[PDB]
Amino acid sequence: SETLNPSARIMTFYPTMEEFRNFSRYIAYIESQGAHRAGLAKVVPPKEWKPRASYDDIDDLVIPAPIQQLVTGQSGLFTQYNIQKKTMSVREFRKIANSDKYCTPRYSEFEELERKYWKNLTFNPPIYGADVNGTLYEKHVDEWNIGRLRTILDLVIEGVNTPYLYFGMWKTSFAWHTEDMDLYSINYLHFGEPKSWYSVPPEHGKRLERLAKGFFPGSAQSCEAFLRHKMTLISPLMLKKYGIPFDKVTQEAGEFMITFPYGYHAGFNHGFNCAESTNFATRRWIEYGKQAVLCSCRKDMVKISMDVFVRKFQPERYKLWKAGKDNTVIDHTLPTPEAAEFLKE
Ligand code: NI
Ligand SMILES: [Zn+2]
């Protein structure tokens, strides 16, 4: 397993229609190939598959709580604050996103747009139409249906077992984080301009945390898991300066990204777009869930009770865990047990 994907580079996968039909089996397959070591993987669906016939009929969809992303900082180190804005429609959002004030700058190569993002992060705070309860999948679509993946997570939270829509514009950001309870996530870009991602391998996540704590000493003092506030922006130049391994990938319309337990990621939208996401689990997640370091400083943070998971999937350790003496050590290289059928017996 420490043999497979030794560089922990982001892998891209092109399932056949037949493989694509079985969601959890395909996740086990990509873990059999080492995809989880990166923390992020791209899955390009078969060209004939579409979750919806068209996106011409959603201009009246409501975005109840858009947020305006205020950013403060310099020299690759920033804090993002969310300002709640008034309810709006998709139509109204698209209008703003494509206006002269907020639209994507002219550029040639990706590297130029990336430079502009990091130069212009603190100016012209954009509006992100984030965390909208809903789905854009037609009700007949049974493949990779983010509204009903039917993983073991269903034994249990909005956006967490439920689908959320995210309407982006240029320069809207997602800060460095892992998922709630160190879950997996899935993200489909339904339409529009790209989304760019950065990732750090799970095996290096503790290294990122230590660097972050040193860069943001005040936030670290007041919370054990301050990165879960989703307010900390760190440029790739700053990671490179302190030897944190990372990778980058651009997700285009019609592509999925999978994030893996304890996979730190961040990134930004290129322009007007719409993405759908939720969390999911495999059997390997349960150990992550049990060991996830949670935000100590806010009430109403997502906290899942692991009890139901430990009783069912780990009966031999239940009494030991319930007493606080389960000291299992996670190996980030190991694929989930479901991957067995794709590995030498
Ligand atoms: Ni995420
Ligand atoms: Zn906190």
From Swiss-Prot:
It is found in: Nucleus. Zn(2+) binds at C223, H229, C295, C297. Fe cation binds at H177, E179, H265. It comes from Homo sapiens (Human). Changing H177A: Abolishes histone demethylase activity without affecting ability to bind H4K20me2. The chain holds residues 5 to 356 of 1064 of the full protein. The 2 Tudor domains recognize and bind methylated histone H3 'Lys-4' residue (H3K4me). Double Tudor domain has an interdigitated structure and the unusual fold is required for its ability to bind methylated histone tails. Trimethylated H3 'Lys-4' (H3K4me3) is bound in a cage of 3 aromatic residues, 2 of which are from the Tudor domain 2, while the binding specificity is determined by side-chain interactions involving residues from the Tudor domain 1. The Tudor domains are also able to bind trimethylated histone H3 'Lys-9' (H3K9me3), di- and trimethylated H4 'Lys-20' (H4K20me2 and H4K20me3). The gene is KDM4A. Ubiquitous. Transmembrane segments: none annotated. Ubiquitinated by RNF8 and RNF168 following DNA damage, leading to its degradation. Degradation promotes accessibility of H4K20me2 mark for DNA repair protein TP53BP1, which is then recruited. Also ubiquitinated by the SCF(FBXO22) complex; leading to proteasomal degradation. Residues 10-52 form the JmjN domain. 2-oxoglutarate binds at Y128, N187, K195, K230. It comes from the Eukaryota. Belongs to the JHDM3 histone demethylase family. Residues 138-297 form the JmjC domain. This is Lysine-specific demethylase 4A. Histone demethylase that specifically demethylates 'Lys-9' and 'Lys-36' residues of histone H3, thereby playing a central role in histone code. Does not demethylate histone H3 'Lys-4', H3 'Lys-27' nor H4 'Lys-20'. Demethylates trimethylated H3 'Lys-9' and H3 'Lys-36' residue, while it has no activity on mono- and dimethylated residues. Demethylation of Lys residue generates formaldehyde and succinate. Participates in transcriptional repression of ASCL2 and E2F-responsive promoters via the recruitment of histone deacetylases and NCOR1, respectively. Interacts with histone deacetylase proteins HDAC1, HDAC2 and HDAC3. Interacts with RB and NCOR1. Interacts with VRK1. Interacts with FBXO22; this interaction promotes KDM4A ubiquitination.
